[PDB]
């Protein structure tokens, strides 16, 4: 019901406004919170989706290690080696 | 004997017994190393600049707010944009600003 002044921590831009009648600045926030409980969930999807990303370059770095090893010392030490390529690609 | 691949395998030829002495486990675990790498390389050159997620919220809010004149059609706006985002998260795909 009646408009309170914004608190502190409030992060709304224009946050004092009362441009819109009837609209606390304690409603925005929780349409802010709506907003940041859909965006959290939304990262999380993106994330696991990047993760899947990243299996499937793995495995197929690990196949083209494996098809072109025919010894298991030498498959190890390739696997090695790429592994140091990508530690140096890292810093740079 | 060839210990077979479990249920869980993530190798192509996982089967393969091409090369001698070499486990299907062995193989996983220097498929996880490589992961490992990746997984590091790719979290620091392309994932330390996302955005700060209330930073997001706050612009989404906003451009919401900006564009209404009355309290309900502000709030039918923002649920609006939470089922867009919503959206975006069913079909793993980001909603970038």
Known sequence: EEFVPPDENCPLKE?????????????????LRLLEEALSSNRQSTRTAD?????????ELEHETFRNAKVANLYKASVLKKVADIHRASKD
């Not at 946050?15 to 349409?31: D, F």
């Not at 993760?51 to 495995?59: F, M, N, S, Y």
């Open 15 to 31: 946050a004092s406004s009362r441009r819109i009648p009837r609209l606390t600045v304690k409603a925005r926030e929780h349409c």
């Open 51 to 59: 993760e899947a990303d990243l299996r499937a370059k793995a495995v």
